[PDB]
């Protein structure tokens, strides 16, 4: 969930 | 069409077989996902400029890229955002109807025209156009605890990622992490010992790590007699850290050969070092599997998990995989719920039919004709190119009730005729169909008319309405068709004759129930006769009830979709400006040890140096993933209660910085969110301090003077932090021998990274980056004692040129539509709606002189356009319903008898919602039910059902009066004839929607909303119509 | 306002708004936006023995953008508490400069 | 230029091919590399899949992965082609002078 | 013929050669028409530059890279107008200088001093047997026959 | 633009200009003396009459 | 082949209102298949002869 995109996770 | 098929049962069965086959072939070729795509096309640029600040990055890259984008066909608006991390993005939003692929192709073709004008570094790294839309499916996590994050990232990228891309249904896999790279950590003291410079290192590494193309022997323009050809080969690239450390920086006449290991230390590292993830405290490397359009989600999740279980046998020691979050269990649960409701509806209709009609071969016709209706609905869904998703399945669950009401109507009429007149099944079926065929056609037309407008909306809510509209309309049309073809033939061929005098002889529970229902019907018709006796009083009572219902309706909050317990909670840490990644890591460890205590949280992912509200070293965010709902069945174990407990604990214990947990909205892209998002621009480029002062003046005008709940209103950017600025005196820099190329060289080399070349690392190319050692990069004195070489080669202190100093500056920039912007937020407290609040803020911004403007943001762009489309569509639907009813009854006055039962259903639904909000505010936490999308859908459903009942009552009363009765006599006998099927349909539908009234678990928020609306609407509207519709008929026939 | 100033304002504010309307194929300004014009004199170049490439290079090398960096970067030593951005202008913005 | 079949493949063609999965309507893929430093990637879609939408989607999937490819590749560029491979005629120009 | 267990090129080549061998002598395929499709792998010339000695004798590496590239490869220098069209100017050695392996084994590179320093000392030329083609099919290494 | 409308585009341009005039500097005005849609609109009006 | 047979059966059952005469009509396909296969086989034998 890193590197600029969070993602729903 | 009914007499044709009553005499041709086999022909009817053939058409049903064709419908079944079409429905199955449609079910087998439908994409399965959690949600559809509601947001509009968006494209992004994502340039990289390492070492650049927000101002440098913005002004030299992002503005240049953006001012070439006006004219891309379909552009709605345009945004830009840069921060102090070296990365910036341009985000173009396009109007609906636009093709995402053509949009992205056009954006790339426009970017190509200006790619040359950007800095050389931005061109080295490259600009990456891409579409924002994502069809997220799953998250994979590799945790080791024994190996670094670089080794895990490399293993993932080399072994695990290229095999998940190959699985059928996967549309894209993304690895969150920086790749490997040959890192060179130069030491400036050792550099000046030998009198070298960073340029020496860069040029040497570019000159000694190069690719050689030798050529061939025996080439094409050859000499006569050449018999052999052969390609020559040479390897001029370095591959290891030893070879890189052996690079020669200076060859002396003495032959000493000083090397690159003398002044630096070379090892394999990472590209950025910015972010760092952890799962429950241990290092991890996460992937993000994303589904492809027209792909099945459950099959792809199953395949991913199986492939990972296969690959796990080659993992190094200590490593393990884990999929904490997966968005296929949602659609799987929705499908299971559809199946369970279908089965329980079958059981309920069986029980009702057997209790009332008192025979078994009556309970087999609905069981046969309902599934065929749903199959035809699936076929139509597949044809129109939709998918199977949470909303489509809710639509099926809703339409089951109407599709069972059709069959109940037909079979009850046929049985009534057969029992009353002792007719065989064929004659009884012919008579019943002659009575109800035109009414069935009119009911279908009216239902289509009332469901169409739901598909003609605009925006994201339009895409959400289209699902229900199309699914329900198709299912209802197929149900009507099956009611005119297959149900009559089934009744004619399956049902058996009733011996004359058969009933009235039952001796058991059946006789007791028959007597009881006879008495109840007698009492009911007595009460309706009383109601018809006094007309003015009941009509004024009805006007009062309708006005009270409208009142209760208008005094109802608004929303889009209620927040749902989707299993996870989001967290956002933020430390004071200027913090480092070490304090952020300590605070994140505190947050992790806190979330461990909460027994409802199972996993916790932690990301450092990144947040949705900006990306900085002093930011972070977590993802608390909760147990399965089966275990979280208690008062304080839902998502909102866990969010509250976590925020409380955070405020209690967090020493440095603060953190807040929240439950995000359902639709991540365009899902309900609250607030009047604003983007204050300045047209005249007055500056940043001036725009900030104007933003604060506007915040002040709004906070107390306005009506916006002064707590909620807030600035939405990133507070300024202290910076270190270096004025360069050019006059004094020229008094000495210092030029301006060397100043730029020294300043840009002392603190930032440098991309010099690439090298092949066991199969794949990677970057080579030079940067100073950490000990020369930490204190403000490492920049003030930076000597620069003058024209005579000697060094000169930079204090005699620059005079560095501290100052407060901006850590983030934003443009909106080409003008510097600054975000603001707010919310009208209560009693003031978004309309007049937005008018007030617009006038406020008008007060601020020219050169400052307001641009709406986010959902306020949708809310800005008036809500006239809804009123227009509803009025047109009402006119169409009136026209259809006038065509059916052959009168311009009778349709008014059926158009007067809308107030009843509206009052019922509104009163039920209000009563639930009161009962849950007195003993519960907060008003949870409002006037949202699900309220609209359930209200349209209840309105359709009530219109159907009223249509049948009125059409039965109109034919009886034609036979030679009065109006009161006709209304009385029509009520007495329709009493039983109305009771049966109500029993079935209400007991079927009851499981939605107490929904608890996955997606139970929308299920509870629709359940409340439908339950109370049906109950109240039926109880009222059963007595008022005869009165409407009587007064409409006596008035004209 | 002069016609050069009005041309600049048009290019900056009015033309982008017009060329992102639905239906506009392209907008053409009968003029040009502003620029910094250096009007060299060859006889003066000769009095000092200079060239045109001399002026070009002197301009290109003294009007550059400096991307400095930051204090306390990500690969840091244990115990670093504060970060800070470094900022140096490097560029020229007026005719007197 | 100057890359063997193996280096060319593993550095460019595999990179493109892996990303080209999931393209709507793809049937099978196939790459090929040579010692001259020139390879290709052929994507065969299903009949009934339009050539134009397929080409636009393939171009978009290629641009995203383009940033990682080597520097010499980006400099020469990756070209797209959707023409047949079997001949229709052969025109022979002949002369005696 | 695909290989899915990543067994290498030599193993797949041997398997394809045995499959071609039993496709003949089976009776269903007429021999002389069963052929391996891809272009055959042939021997190559490898140059192994010695950076240690190349530096001991005062020889750069950009110099070695310029020498090797210029001897056997055409360079595209500029454009010239030929009867109303811009066409290419191309530089390259004449045929006599790029036909044998001795023409590349006897090259010399400028020393810092300006001397010859034959490539026979700061390098080692030898014959190899490299792959002239590498094919994949559906993500796996493949070899074609017919 | 190919597939563009004249009357719609002219109306949109004039409305956007009316809106943009709020931020003009002091003394600056706008006017479209040459407009190709007035003829279309007057012709349609005459035909309808 | 199976789709063709099923379609014939269903269409005939609809038109003539029976589930039996479609059976009688579908019992005549094996004759055509035997004829076609035997014809191909016999012509192959003749040409080989
Ligand atoms: C799909 C295939 C559906 C089957 C074909 C339509 C059969 C149903 C109507 C056939 C029919 O002759 O019924 C009469 C015509 O219906 C009519 O009222 C006129 C035709 C209306 C039915 C057309 C159905 C098309 C939609 C089917 C989907 C009844 O009415 P009648 O009084 O004219 O009796 C004259 C009897 N030959
Ligand atoms: C989903 C589609 C499933 C149905 C597929 C049907 C395939 C062909 C079946 C044709 C069967 C037609 C039988 C109609 C009854 C026999 C004719 C008759 O005597 O009806 C009297 C009037 O016919 C009339 O008035 C005309 C009736 C014409 C019916 C045509 C049905 C559509 C084909
Ligand atoms: C007295 C009462 C009697 C009532 C009547 C009997 C009860 C019927 C109950 C069963 C319901 C009707 C039968 C529906 C079965 C499912 C059909 C699905 C077919 C499908 O997948 O498409 O086509 C298109 C694709 C074409 C190419 C793909 C074809 C795939 C091969 C299909 C082979 C199977 C079908 C042919 C042989 C049966
Ligand atoms: C009675 C005939 C059905 C009429 C109403 C059906 C409603 C429920 C059908 C199941 C559903 O909605 O989605 C299916 C669930 O898949 C499945 O796993 C099959 C569900 C079991 C069959 C439905 C049982 C009747 C309820 C297909 O969804 P899918 O695309 O994932 O299936 C891939 C198959 N090739
Ligand atoms: C680009 C060009 C666009 C052109 C646009 C054209 C727009 C015009 C559209 C006209 C739509 C008319 C809608 C009529 C709605 C009729 C609803 C009631 C029909 C009904 O159930 O009455 C039965 C008659 O059966 C029937 O026969 C009803 C047939 C109605 C079919 C719908 C038409 C009574 O029958 P009964 O029970 O009294 O015996
Ligand atoms: C043999 C059995 C086959 C079962 C499935 C057949 C499904 C075929 C499609 C339905 C027929 C078209 C109905 C229709 O009005 O057209 C579509 C609905 O229009 C709309 O968008 C608005 C209306 C949507 C609800 C209409 C529900 C009708 C369901 C069919 C009733 C049949 C009753 C039983 C005979 C528009 O599609 P398009 O042409 O504009 O574009 C093509 C996109 N792929
Ligand atoms: C919702 C629409 C409500 C419309 C109610 C009109 C009722 C008029 C009945 C008047 C009457 O005495 O009969 O005749 C007559 O002249 C009745 C007036 C003509 C009715 C035409 C209705 C067209 C509606 C289009 C809007
Ligand atoms: C190969 C092509 C096969 C086509 C389908 C063959 C089905 C044969 C059923 C014949 C039954 C024997 C006749 C009979 O009356 O018994 O019976 C009864 O009353 C029930 C008979 C129900 C037969 C339904 C056949 C539907 C076929 C649907 C295929 C999809």
Author numbering:
A (entry chain D): 120 to 128
B (entry chain B): 1 to 1040
C (entry chain A): 147 to 243
D (entry chain C): 50 to 146
E (entry chain C): 680 to 825
F (entry chain A): 292 to 340
G (entry chain C): 874 to 922
From the paper:
In Neisseria gonorrhoeae, the best-characterized and most clinically important multidrug efflux system is the multiple transferrable resistance (MtrCDE) tripartite efflux pump, a member of the widely distributed resistance-nodulation-cell division (RND) superfamily in Gram-negative bacteria. This multidrug efflux pump couples with the MtrC periplasmic membrane fusion protein and the MtrE outer membrane channel to actively extrude antimicrobials and mediate drug resistance. Based on the cryo-EM structures of MtrDCR103-CASP, MtrDCR103-Col, and MtrDCR103-LL, we observed that MtrDCR103 employs different binding modes to anchor linear and cyclic peptides.
The reconstituted sample led to a cryo-EM map at a nominal resolution of 2.95 Å, allowing us to obtain a structural model of this pump-peptide complex. In MtrDCR103-CASP, the three MtrDCR103 protomers display the typical “access,” “binding,” and “extrusion” conformations. An extra density corresponding to the CASP molecule is observed to anchor at the distal drug binding pocket of the binding protomer. No extra densities are found in the access and extrusion protomers. It appears that a number of residues are engaged in anchoring this peptide, including those within the entrance drug binding site, F-loop, proximal drug binding site, G-loop, distal drug binding site, and hydrophobic patch. Within 4.5 Å of bound CASP, there are 19 residues participating in binding. These residues are H46, F136, I139, M141, R174, F176, S275, T277, A288, M290, Y325, F568, I605, V607, F610, F612, F623, I625, and L668. Particularly, we found that the side chains of R174 and T277 are involved in forming two hydrogen bonds with bound CASP to further secure peptide binding.
